[PDB]
């Protein structure tokens, strides 16, 4: 069939699975583990399918897909069959990632281009979004995701500072989070965490926290730095999943739903599973 | 939230598939808003409300000139954001004919 | 974008940018002169509005928006405004302006409190981010504005002083009344609508003054219950001061609006407040209106 599966995610009911390939098709599949019933094909892009993502149920089951065209062509089942419900193109230069935000964060659509620019819009059925962009990195953004959870501002007016936080990863070895500001022009950058000597690849935040927020920033320097935020709002300190160069070229590194079990996809086609050890460092569970 | 699921994703089927002969499904629509809060009505009805004024005017026959106007002016706006949502649009035409 | 097209200059002053272009008066120097004019401005004999206007300094939107964009008036064919104004003013595409204003304010890029104002000027619901935190008084205020704007628009529409040209975005032409507003206000804010001083605030506007005098007497009958004797009349002592006093005034005004009996029971309640204290000098002045 496909000789190569690049990456492949699932919906939020766990009945569908969307395969990003490289022959420009998005094959929507039905998840039954290894076997799948191919229900649809959506060819209509240029070059490798880098990323697709499924919408959080309360803003459809919308599927926003990016290829090397540098455009997100959004697909939506209208009539029980796939069609095109939208188009985007404010940044073209290859859209690498294409994410939907948590329920509380809204139907925000995270675009991250390799021109050092990043869009952040809203999905509308009546149309209209205001074009808000903030510059992340400079040599490009090879992956983007979504910050942990929305915060609370207390007082008499909620949703003031922090709020929707955007985490990105450029090719200039720099990983950091934001803080949506409304009193200082562009998004005031936090702290530049330089701990990389080769381009940043994948970034994932842990939807499981205790007293610190974990941020797995992968790189092509064959290590994964785990950024432990001290008391969750403290500084980001250096905690090493492995201190040494793995003889594996690491790609994705995505956390589980519960737990701080992290899967890192090694270049030798072996997905190690890491748990944090007897100390603050990490040891493999497999 | 439940306002949004009949008006932003699938127009009422008790004003599209309803039989016009005896209007039995149309008055199920009416009666199940009598089972949903009326102690706090004017905080969740703004899509559902258009349905309410419509239903009282036609079902129960409350033909007043003022009532007629109130619905029409409101229904121009209403038509102007869900004349392009699927299903909802087809239901507006039924409402107008009635 | 003047500063660099790809890699050019780095200074922010005109002549260190382009030498073609002279230094203008800007920064701190603009700020010093601003202050100077402002001092003069707080002299009129209306130093309370003049001062407010004077601070809306610098940007045109701050002061210009407040100077008004107005509805057409011409005192040459209209004799009734020809001693109130001596010259023609007001844009005749005012209605058209109002609709454009609406579309801007709902979109972000400006501060939330700014947005709620612009929307409110044109006869529309403020921005969502402010609207969620408004109390009873702020919510009420909005909805009364709407009633006035809709009715005016209806009378002008028929004489064809407002056309299709002005419409960029429709507004409705529906009838509304206050009674309906209070039911909106009360379903969003339940605890506050029952708040004592606020009950009386609603009642004058509908002119439900006689009725409300009678309803209070019925409560006093209910007071022989235990739930009632305990509470719902010891919870607002200062609101009973007001109702007795108002009762006297309405019954002088016309003692058949509401009963003498109703006024007389209310006095018995005002008298109980005198009793808590230990006053008895004041009773005969109340006794004449019993």
UniProtKB/Swiss-Prot annotation, chain A:
Could you tell me the keywords of this UniProt record?
Answer: Cytoplasmic vesicle, Endoplasmic reticulum, ER-Golgi transport, Membrane, mRNA transport, Nuclear pore complex, Nucleus, Protein transport, Repeat, Translocation, Transport, Vacuole, WD repeat
* PANTHER family named among the record's database cross-references: NUCLEAR PORE COMPLEX PROTEIN SEC13 / SEH1 FAMILY MEMBER, PROTEIN SEC13 HOMOLOG
Could you tell me the membrane topology recorded for this protein? Peripheral membrane protein
Q: Which organism is it from?
A: Saccharomyces cerevisiae (strain ATCC 204508 / S288c) (Baker's yeast)
Q: Which SMART domains match?
A: WD40 (SM00320)
As for family, the record states:
Belongs to the WD repeat SEC13 family.
Task: Determine if Nucleus is one of this entry's keywords.
Answer: yes
Give the GO cellular component terms, alphabetically: cell periphery; COPII vesicle coat; endoplasmic reticulum; endoplasmic reticulum membrane; nuclear envelope; nuclear pore; nuclear pore outer ring; Seh1-associated complex
Some GO term, biological process aspect, for this entry: which one?
Answer: COPII-coated vesicle budding
Q: What is the lineage of its organism?
A: Eukaryota, Fungi, Dikarya, Ascomycota, Saccharomycotina
Q: Which gene encodes it?
A: SEC13
Question: What is its quaternary makeup?
Answer: The basic repeat unit of a COPII coated vesicle is composed of 5 proteins: the small GTPase SAR1, the heterodimeric SEC23-SEC24 complex, and the heterotetrameric SEC13-SEC31 complex. This repeat unit polymerizes to induce membrane deformation into a transport vesicle. Component of the nuclear pore complex (NPC). NPC constitutes the exclusive means of nucleocytoplasmic transport.
Where is it located? Answer: Cytoplasmic vesicle, COPII-coated vesicle membrane; Endoplasmic reticulum membrane; Nucleus, Nuclear pore complex; Vacuole membrane
Q: Which Gene3D superfamilies does this one have?
A: YVTN repeat-like/Quinoprotein amine dehydrogenase
Task: Tell me what else is known.
Answer: Present with 21400 molecules/cell in log phase SD medium.
What is the protein name for this chain?
Answer: Protein transport protein SEC13
Q: Where are the WD repeats?
A: 1-39, 44-85, 90-131, 136-188, 195-237, 245-284
The record's listing under InterPro entries reads: Sec13/Seh1_fam (IPR037363), WD40/YVTN_repeat-like_dom_sf (IPR015943), WD40_repeat_dom_sf (IPR036322), WD40_rpt (IPR001680)
Q: Name one GO molecular function term.
A: structural molecule activity
> What is the documented function of this protein?
Functions as a component of the nuclear pore complex (NPC) and the COPII coat. It is one of 5 proteins constituting the COPII coat, which is involved in anterograde (ER to Golgi) double-membrane transport vesicle formation. First the small GTPase SAR1, activated by and binding to the integral ER membrane protein SEC12, exchanges GDP for GTP and recruits the heterodimer SEC23/24, which in turn recruits the heterotetramer SEC13-SEC31. The polymerization of COPII coat complexes then causes physically the deformation (budding) of the membrane, leading to the creation of a transport vesicle.
UniProtKB/Swiss-Prot annotation, chain C:
Organism placement in taxonomy: Eukaryota, Fungi, Dikarya, Ascomycota, Saccharomycotina
The gene is NUP84
Protein name (Swiss-Prot/TrEMBL): Nucleoporin NUP84
Q: What species was this sequence derived from?
A: Saccharomyces cerevisiae (strain ATCC 204508 / S288c) (Baker's yeast)
Q: What else is known?
A: Present with 8580 molecules/cell in log phase SD medium.
Give the function comment from the record. Functions as a component of the nuclear pore complex (NPC). NPC components, collectively referred to as nucleoporins (NUPs), can play the role of both NPC structural components and of docking or interaction partners for transiently associated nuclear transport factors. NUP84 is involved in nuclear poly(A)+ RNA export, in NPC assembly and distribution, as well as in nuclear envelope organization.
| Family indicated by similarity | Belongs to the Nup84/Nup107 nucleoporin family.
Quote the subunit structure annotation: Component of the nuclear pore complex (NPC). NPC constitutes the exclusive means of nucleocytoplasmic transport. NPCs allow the passive diffusion of ions and small molecules and the active, nuclear transport receptor-mediated bidirectional transport of macromolecules such as proteins, RNAs, ribonucleoparticles (RNPs), and ribosomal subunits across the nuclear envelope. Due to its 8-fold rotational symmetry, all subunits are present with 8 copies or multiples thereof.
Q: Where in the cell is it found?
A: Nucleus, Nuclear pore complex; Nucleus membrane
